[PDB]
Symmetry: C3
Subunit: 308 residues, 3 copies
């Protein structure tokens, strides 16, 4: 089962420009050539060419609706194709709003996929509860069935079909959830391991509980949507919304090594890398290298070593 690298240099889902540079920054590190070194065959789809929507005025408080909807509708189609072709999709992107297309496309082919969301945030605010109107903080809202109809139709998102149930997603790294989002994950019974449960249980038991919860009954495709801000600012500083007390570099790798071991990874997202937000060049180097390491970890690179 080969790998399909897909670049999504998009930032309209958030206010901080620079995130569209993430794909180039990651490729610059030799991500594709380093991935080919693994036991997986790699193919680089290249980046997508998202084109802005003319009079794309805010829909209520939501900004760039049509453009974010259009960019995502294209990614869904792209990821759906690659998924149908028996390959694992890996999206390097701008902001996390792209998880809409990525996950949607992935779910069209594998409607039984489960999601592991590594983030400092729940990104589950909806067009009504969001206190910012930035779409990278609402992706899970357009994807969850339980939220379907719980908010007005958004211009440009008519194509989206709620593909995942509240029971098919697990959050890890949470530590900056707004009032609305917390109410939601709580009333919907969504499984999450906030930084509190990680400190209490240790990353080892956390993954055990994540897999028993998602892959307990039967096995199914795993979609890992990784927001680099899920890790501590010490390791992934070049990002739009950094939050202290995050996942360590080590816990980040552990998560990926365990996901690798299941042999069920079907879709992967590496998001929010913003190379223009490094206080120094080295904070970017640090962020990019951590992102590359986790990506390779998802595909076999183990810290104890590897050989053929």
């Amino acid at each position: 089962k080969p790998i399909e690298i897909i670049g999504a240099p998009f930032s309209k889902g958030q206010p901080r420009g620079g995130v569209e540079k993430g794909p180039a920054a990651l490729r610059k590190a030799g991500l594709v050539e380093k991935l080919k070194e693994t036991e997986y065959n790699v193919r680089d789809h290249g980046d997508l060419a998202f084109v802005d929507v003319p009079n794309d005025s805010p829909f209520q408080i939501v900004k760039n609706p049509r453009s974010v909807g259009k960019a995502n509708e294209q990614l869904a189609a792209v990821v759906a194709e690659t998924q149908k072709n028996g390959t694992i999709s890996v999206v390097l992107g701008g902001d996390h709003s792209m998880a809409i297309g990525s996950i949607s496309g992935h779910a069209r082919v594998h409607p039984d996929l489960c999601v592991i969301w590594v983030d400092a945030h729940t990104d589950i605010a909806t067009p009504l509860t969001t206190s910012s109107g930035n779409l990278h903080g609402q992706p899970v809202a357009f994807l969850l069935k339980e939220l379907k109809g719980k908010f007005p139709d958004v211009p440009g998102f008519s194509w989206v079909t709620p593909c995942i149930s509240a029971k098919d997603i697990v959050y890890i790294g949470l530590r900056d959830v707004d009032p609305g989002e917390h109410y939601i994950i709580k009333t919907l019974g969504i499984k999450y391991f906030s930084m509190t449960e990680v400190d209490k249980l240790g990353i080892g038991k956390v993954m055990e509980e994540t897999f028993s919860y998602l892959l307990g009954r039967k096995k199914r495709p795993i979609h890992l949507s990784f927001d680099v801000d899920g890790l501590d600012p010490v390791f992934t500083p070049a990002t739009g919304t950094p939050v202290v007390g995050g996942l360590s570099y080590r816990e980040g790798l552990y998560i990926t090594e365990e996901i690798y071991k299941t042999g069920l990874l079907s879709g992967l997202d590496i998001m929010e890398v913003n190379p223009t937000l490094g206080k120094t060049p080295e904070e970017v180097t640090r962020t990019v290298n951590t992102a590359v390491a986790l990506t390779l970890s998802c595909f076999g690179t183990k810290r104890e070593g590897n050989h053929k």
Copy 2:
């Protein structure tokens, strides 16, 4: 149960910079406005005016005996006051010698309370074992009932009445304990979780054992005396006695979240925040914001999120 914020700009406990701006530093950070946003009511008692004792000559080695023990009285009378009004006292001050006043007065109203002391130090040096003479490193010595009758009375500490036994306190975070102190903690059988114990058990087990030890029998008012230098210098830089290998930001929040969950927190101290000891501008801010985060956590703010 409402909250009572008490200021304590006192630095006669230690020479290093000026830890009096601490109270004023935490306020500017918006500590009061954020606490009111919690499920508690909040009232600011204002910063106490400490009268400096005249020819307050050192006692053998201890410096500013009268001055220190006087500032603690006003505070101790101010604390006992709030404790009687059925309010939770939150002392925002300078050096940790002020724990003498906070705890004594708290114990005057609630003599059955227990103590959780987060610190890199034991601060249990007697006026005779101490190697510096600074009182910020002797509070537990003027508070323990087993230590009374082990050192000459000190000018200005006659009022103090040993309010805690050797089985009513639990230390968490130890990593720099002088020979004298280590003998006492061991001879008296004081319960403690040095960093060694934290590394071994993990902060999750550390709190389970703490509560089991202090509350296993009867439930009682908990007094949390938090010395910011209990957290690793990488997190709480602006402090007088930094020691590498301390508690992490996450472990610090775990402690406070678990304590809030007991519903027993009755007294609190957030000491040693010296904003004048911050190499760079962001080391003071980082220290102050961590101090504020630790306080909010104590009163309900959780990393998994909150909502009304």
Copy 3:
């Protein structure tokens, strides 16, 4: 139980700056003084003078054989002599190639000894598998009985006899293993706890298993070979091959404290400190102060405290 410091200012085992200055830097940080403050009697044998061999050209891919072989021959005799007298040897060296002579010498007096290797690397590449030819990355290859005969004899190493069995050594901290090396530890069934195992189990369990595996059936002397790069670069930056995601300052101390508690420590190596690789003079101080603290910990210095 007396202690004898043995200086090994060598660097021909690798390229980089000046690891020969390692011993001078540690004594500078007052390692001898601090050692004499513990419960052990200390003595400093000073630094050994190594005779640089003439036409010492490369053997196949292996660099400076005759130089590294002879040097280790000198150290083996010296460490063998000190061990003879009933003293614990502490070797402060340059690069890790010096463990060949340190462990070889040690095994002559304690042939039943075991080894705990703290490193980010396995240092078990043979002259045929090595991709660099630097001998500081092949020490364990010379020491293991299971590997004798698996590679060609090296000029200047005929004085070496495999002393340790593939079942008498445990690795802790691994995170940068070469294909050849990984194949070897897997095929030879060597016990190791890579960063993955430490993240999984916690450092507390790692030492419990390390000891059960090593001291379970028979109690015997312990030789600790500590490569400072086993700890994360944020703590020990001044070293030749730093690798991110390492053991923390706290974990390294736990390791040493636990080893100390067994009462079986008999040999110790504090390697790879290069006070010229420090990006800044402080990065050197930080690396130096950390190695000194680990040494002191091996001899009873505990974070909970120490008294006479």
